[PDB]
Amino acid sequence: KIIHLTDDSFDTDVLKADGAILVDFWAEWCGACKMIAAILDEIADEYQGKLTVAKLNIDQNAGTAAKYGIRGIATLLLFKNGEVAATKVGALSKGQLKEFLDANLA
Numbered sequence: 251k252i253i254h255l256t257d258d259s260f261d262t263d264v265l266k267a268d269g270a271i272l273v274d275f276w277a278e279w280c281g282a283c284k285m286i287a288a289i290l291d292e293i294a295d296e297y298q299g300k301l302t303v304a305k306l307n308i309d310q311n312a313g314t315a316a317k318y319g320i321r322g323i324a325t326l327l328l329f330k331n332g333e334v335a336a337t338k339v340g341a342l343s344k345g346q347l348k349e350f351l352d353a354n355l356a
Contacts, residue, residue, distance in 0.1 A: 251294050253304035257313040263304060265332040270355055274305045275315060275325040282324035282341035289344045293351070300355060328354050 255263055255273065264271050274290060276283040294303040308315035308322065318327060318334070328336040328351075336354040338347075 251298065251303070252290060253302060255304050255306040255311070255314075257311040260306070260311075260314045264329050267302070267329070267332075270301050270335070271329040272301055272303045272351070273327045273329060274303070275308050275318070275320045275327070276305060277307065277309050277322065280322075280324055285341040286324055286326065286347075289347060292344065293347055296348075297351060297355075301351065326350070 253263055253271075264273060272293075274283075274286060276287065290303055290305075294301075297303075306314055308320055315322075318325075324340055326338040326347075327334050336350065338350050342350070
């Protein structure tokens with residue numbers, strides 16, 4: 251149930267979205283990105299109903315990565331109503347991601 255994002259679809263899929271959206275900004279040559287990838291599916295399943303998880307490859311979608319100042323580093327942005335509600339940069343554990351979501355979701 252993870253949404254695949256492109257520069258083309260970001261507005262519709264994320265900014266014009268209903269409900270909180272967790273966007274994972276990632277790249278292939280990025281080790282922290284793989285640690286985050288490893289835990290996203292479980293998280294998506296556990297927060298179904300109050301969160302949607304999405305991925306944007308920043309090598310293929312340089313437009314949106316530039317807009318949010320990603321600068322090539324593993325980044326999670328939580329979106330609500332077209333705005334960034336919370337930010338996490340770099341690798342983190344299943345536990346730290348649960349904390350992040352629980353602290354920043356209703």
